[PDB]
């Protein structure tokens, strides 16, 4: 699956959206600042490396996930996650997560992640498009590109 091969490496979070504003808001567990992704293609495993602000404090994460059939990435972090890469350019990355907590609540999360700068404005459209498709309100879109004050 072309996309899954090429994704390994550094990433920066540009935009996130969610059906649940609390989740990606200040102190939300999905206010995620990506650092990088590692694909272990033989072992069918992925590693997401990123920071969340936890009580104003930068906390590094390294979350393991498995690549299943039809490329659904599943991994534990703040509950169960069912993750998919929607699209990849060499500059960009669009992800869609479905999160489920212990009480079974469902949080949809869309992410635009960048490789560096000079971000394709067209990419933004594809992102908002996706966000719309998955029933996320346009007001629930947040730009994180300029608040990444965590290490590295």
DSSP string, 11-69: -EEEEEEES-HHHHSTT-TT-EEEEEEEEETTTTEEEEEEEEESSS-EEEEEEEEEE-G
**Determination technique used:** X-ray
CB atoms closer than 10 angstroms to residue 7: 19
Q: Report the DSSP beta bridge partners of residue 12.
A: 114
Give the residue numbers spanning the domain of 79. 1-152
**How many CA atoms, within 13 angstroms, populate the side-chain half-sphere of residue 40?**
9
Chain Cα centroid distance, residue 71: 16
- Breaks in the chain (C–N > 2.5 Å) following residue: none
Q: What are the Cα distances from residue 31, in Å, to 52, 85, 92?
A: 6, 18, 18
Number of structural domains found in the chain: 1
**DSSP three-state, residue 105:** coil
**How many CA atoms, within 13 angstroms, populate the side-chain half-sphere of residue 54?**
9
């Amino acid at each position: 699956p072309n996309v899954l091969t090429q994704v390994s490496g550094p990433w920066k979070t540009l935009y996130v959206s969610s059906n649940n504003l609390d989740k990606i808001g200040e102190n939300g567990p999905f206010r995620i600042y990506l650092r990088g992704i590692n694909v272990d293609i033989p072992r069918l495993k992925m590693l997401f490396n990123f920071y969340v602000k936890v009580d104003g404090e930068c906390v590094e994460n390294s979350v393991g996930a498995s690549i299943g059939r039809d490329n659904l990435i599943k991994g534990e972090y703040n509950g169960g996650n069912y993750f998919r890469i929607i699209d990849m350019t060499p500059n960009a990355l669009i992800g869609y997560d479905v999160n489920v907590d212990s009480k079974g609540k469902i949080t949809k999360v869309a992410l635009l992640m960048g490789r560096g700068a000079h971000v394709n404005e067209e990419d933004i459209a594809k992102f908002k498009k996706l966000s719309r498709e998955k029933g996320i309100p346009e007001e629930n879109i947040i730009y994180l590109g300029d608040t990444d004050n965590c290490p590295n």
